[PDB]
Design a protein around this ligand. Structure first.
Ligand SMILES: CCOc1ccc(C(C)=O)cc1-c1cc(NC(=O)c2ccco2)cc(-c2ccn(C)n2)c1
Length: 114
């Protein structure tokens, strides 16, 4: 099945804005992780493939996907990175898990749609 670029944005962006809407849980994820700014200099020794909401939003704003699981792939990569780097007890890890709950709720019916 082919997917028109304007169609994905209009049908996938609601799932993305549902993540941005989570405050404060989306705050760690709205911009790429800057290890020097954040005081976590070891981040890239653990996270080899970074991803964040702003990169996803900019991709989606230029239709730079091809089918929904591509977008899913980036969102899950952002989640997996955060669960790998941050400790289970940590605020950012818990924020990530909240976002992941919201995202599964929103993405399951949009995935059934196409
Ligand atoms: C060192 C701890 O920061 C992090 C560590 C790891 C990760 C990841 C994604 O693995 C993310 C952050 C992080 C967290 C927060 N905000 C909160 O944690 C928060 C907000 C309210 C209560 O808590 C903000 C920003 C941020 C925002 C702008 N910039 C430039 N940076 C980055």
């Amino acid at each position: 099945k082919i997917f028109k670029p304007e169609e994905l944005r209009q049908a996938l962006m609601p799932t993305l804005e549902a993540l941005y809407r989570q405050d404060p849980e989306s705050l760690p994820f709205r911009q790429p992780v800057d290890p020097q700014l954040l005081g976590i200099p070891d981040y890239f020794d653990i996270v080899k493939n970074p991803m964040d909401l702003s990169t996803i939003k900019r991709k989606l704003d230029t239709g730079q996907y091809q089918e929904p699981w591509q977008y899913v792939d980036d969102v899950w990569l952002m989640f997996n990175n955060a669960w790998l780097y941050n400790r289970k007890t940590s605020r950012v890890y818990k924020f990530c898990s909240k976002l992941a709950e919201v995202f599964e709720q929103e993405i399951d019916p949009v995935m059934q749609s196409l």
